[PDB]
Every structure is written in C-alpha cells, then in structure tokens.
Amino acid sequence: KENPMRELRIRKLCLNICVGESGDRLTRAAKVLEQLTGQTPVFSKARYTVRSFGIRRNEKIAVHCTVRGAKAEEILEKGLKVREYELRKNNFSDTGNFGFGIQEHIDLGIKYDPSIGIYGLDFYVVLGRPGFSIADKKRRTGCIGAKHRISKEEAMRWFQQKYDGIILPG
RNA sequence: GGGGAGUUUGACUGGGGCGGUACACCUGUCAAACGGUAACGCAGGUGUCCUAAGGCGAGCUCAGGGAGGACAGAAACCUC
Ligand SMILES: [Mg+2]
Ligand SMILES: [Mg+2]
Numbered sequence: 633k634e635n636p637m638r639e640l641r642i643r644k645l646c647l648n649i650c651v652g653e654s655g656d657r658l659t660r661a662a663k664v665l666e667q668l669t670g671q672t673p674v675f676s677k678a679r680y681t682v683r684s685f686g687i688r689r690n691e692k693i694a695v696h697c698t699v700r701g702a703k704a705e706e707i708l709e710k711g712l713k714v715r716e717y718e719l720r721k722n723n724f725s726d727t728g729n730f731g732f733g734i735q736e737h738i739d740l741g742i743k744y745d746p747s748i749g750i751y752g753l754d755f756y757v758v759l760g761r762p763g764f765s766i767a768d769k770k771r772r773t774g775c776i777g778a779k780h781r782i783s784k785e786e787a788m789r790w791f792q793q794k795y796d797g798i799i800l801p802g
Numbered sequence: 803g804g805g806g807a808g809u810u811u812g813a814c815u816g817g818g819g820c821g822g823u824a825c826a827c828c829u830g831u832c833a834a835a836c837g838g839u840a841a842c843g844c845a846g847g848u849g850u851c852c853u854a855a856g857g858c859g860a861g862c863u864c865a866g867g868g869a870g871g872a873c874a875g876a877a878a879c880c881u882c
Contacts (some may be wrong), residue, residue, distance in 0.1 A: 646881060648881095678879085685878045694880075698881095723871080725882065731871045752807040754872070754879085
C-alpha cells in the first residue's frame with residue numbers, strides 16, 4: 633500500500649545567472665531571464681571583495697529568480713529536453729534536491745537577439761513533500777521528522793520514473 | 803632695545819639627572835569568595851566617533867561546516 637499524499641512533488645525551481653560584473657551585460661542577462669521566467673528577477677550583490685575575479689563589495693553581479701507550480705514544471709521540462717533527460721549520479725544532493733546547468737539559453741525556446749548576446753544559466757529544483765511548510769511557517773515551526781524527508785535514492789527513483797530519464801554513472 | 807631692571811625656570815622618583823607618567827580617566831588581575839586595599843606591579847585602552855552607529859515599529863538570523871549547480875577553481879552567485 634501507500635499514503636496517497638506522502639508522494640513527491642517539486643516545490644520550487646530556481647534559475648540563476650552569475651555574470652561577475654555589473655552593467656549592460658547584467659541588465660541584458662536580467663532581460664533574458666525575465667523573458668524566460670515570465671516575471672521580474674532580482675539582483676544579488678557581491679558578499680565580499682576579491683580582485684582575482686575583479687569584483688568588489690556590494691555590486692550586483694548575478695540575477696536570479698524562483699518559480700513554483702505550472703511554470704516550474706514547464707521550465708524544467710524545457711531544461712530536461714535540452715539535456716535530453718540525462719543526469720549523473722553526482723548531480724543529486726544528499727537532501728533530495730538536484731539541478732544542472734545550460735551553457736546557452738536560446739536552445740530551450742528563446743529567440744536569438746544579437747543585442748542581448750548569449751548567456752548560460754543554472755537550473756536547480758528542490759523536491760518537496762506535502763507538509764514541508766512546517767519547517768518554515770511562522771506560528772508553530774518544527775522539523776519534518778525522519779521518515780518524511782527525501783533522500784538521494786528517492787529523488788533518483790522519482791526522476792527516473794516520472795520523467796523516464798536515465799542516470800548515467802559518473 | 804639683555805645696554806639695564808625685576809622675576810621665574812612644576813611634581814613624582816629605590817639619591818639626583820636622563821628615561822618614563824604610575825599626574826585626569828577606563829577594563830582584567832593583583833586582592834587573601836561583601837566592599838575597600840600598595841609599588842616606576844602585570845596585560846591593555848582614552849582626549850575620539852555617530853542625522854545615525856540616536857528613538858520607536860515590523861520582518862529576518864549570525865560564525866562556521868556538509869552536500870549539490872555552465873564557464874566557476876581553494877575562494878564570485880543560487881539551493882537544501
Ligand atoms: Mg637680566
Ligand atoms: Mg575577603
């Protein structure tokens with residue numbers, strides 16, 4: 633048997649692009665990201681100052697956004713279609729989440745505009761389960777127990793069964 | 803305008819002088835489980851800075867570590 637609603641569902645999908653310098657490149661990356669995600673993304677300032685990468689304290693160097701639900705699985709479907717539903721054993725974290733990256737963006741269904749240029753990005757997905765909001769709600773916060781959490785094997789099974797993908801070793 | 807006049811040229815202090823400030827303040831210890839308690843005892847700090855680094859209210863949680871993610875690495879950004 634099974635519990636009808638202890639099943640696995642994706643609860644958020646995070647997209648980010650880290651360009652490493654503020655300016656026209658940054659705002660065009662924000663533009664392509666918001667065109668892809670249908671909503672305005674946000675800028676993240678540099679935490680520290682390191683001159684090896686040519687960055688300083690508190691300038692926007694990356695643009696990221698998060699999605700839930702319908703648009704989340706559509707974007708994830710596009711990304712996995714680009715990655716031909718192929719992932720590696722080490723692509724999955726110990727907490728049940730996973731992710732990957734796309735070297736360039738116009739392949740997943742984005743028209744090439746010569747002005748904006750080309751940009752890669754990182755997809756990440758946080759596998760969830762009904763009741764995970766306990767860990768972050770305000771009134772009576774608590775843990776999510778031991779049985780209810782997600783492990784690497786469960787994430788692998790969910791990925792290979794729902795999206796009929798292949799986990800090549802590596 | 804030392805030609806001439808009057809006067810002054812601190813204190814502390816293992817003699818005085820040179821050095822130093824133990825000369826006004828602050829922290830720990832000395833200090834002997836109330837408080838107080840000495841030495842040129844020990845380790846140090848002060849003559850500032852702030853329109854917010856003051857005053858309320860709201861919302862968040864930090865250092866670090868582990869596991870993941872294109873360039874990305876020991877270190878850039880995202881997630882748990
Ligand atoms: Mg005389
Ligand atoms: Mg006594």
